[PDB]
From a paper:
Furthermore, the GATXXGAT-like, TGAT-ATTA-like repeats are also frequently associated with wild type [name] and [name]/IGH target genes. In order to gain more insight into the true nature of [name]-DRE interaction, we have determined the structure of [name] [name] bound with endogeneous [name] DNA sequences derived from the B-ALL patient RNA-seq and ChIP-seq analysis. The crystal of [name]-DREERG diffracted remarkably well (1.6 Å) compared with that of [name]–DREconsensus (2.6 Å). Consistent with previous report, one [name] DNA duplex can bind to two [name] molecules. Unlike the previous 2.6 Å [name]-DREconsensue structure, the electron density map of [name] DNA is of high quality (1.6 Å) and allows clear registration of [name] sequences, 5′-T1GATGAGATT11-3′/3′-A1CTACTCTAA11-5′. The electron density map of the last pair of nucleotides, T11 and A11, are disordered and hence not available for model building. In this structure, the Arg95 and Arg98 side-chains dip into the minor groove. In particular, Arg98 forms a hydrogen bond with the hydroxyl group of T1 nucleotide. To our surprise, the Asn144 and Arg148 form two pairs of hydrogen bond with the G2 and A3 nucleotide. Consistently with previous observation, the high-resolution [name]-DNAERG structure reveals an interesting Gln143-water-nucleotide network in the major groove. In this report, the 1.6 Å [name]-DNAERG structure demonstrates a strong association between [name] homeobox and TGAT.
Residue numbers in the entry: 2 to 59
Amino acid sequence: RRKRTAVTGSQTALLLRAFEKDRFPGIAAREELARETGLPESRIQIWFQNRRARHPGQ
C-alpha cells in the first residue's frame, strides 16, 4: 500500500479536461500534467487508468 493521494476538486477538473483531449497520455504529457496539477506523474497514470475503466467519455 502507498499512501492514498488526495486529489482535489480543481485537480480532478484539470484531469477531466486533459482526458477529453487524449485518454492515453504518454509519459511526457503526463509529466506536463504532473507539473500543472501538482500530482506525481505516477498518480496521473493511475487516474487515467481508472477513468478509462470506469467512466470513458462524458
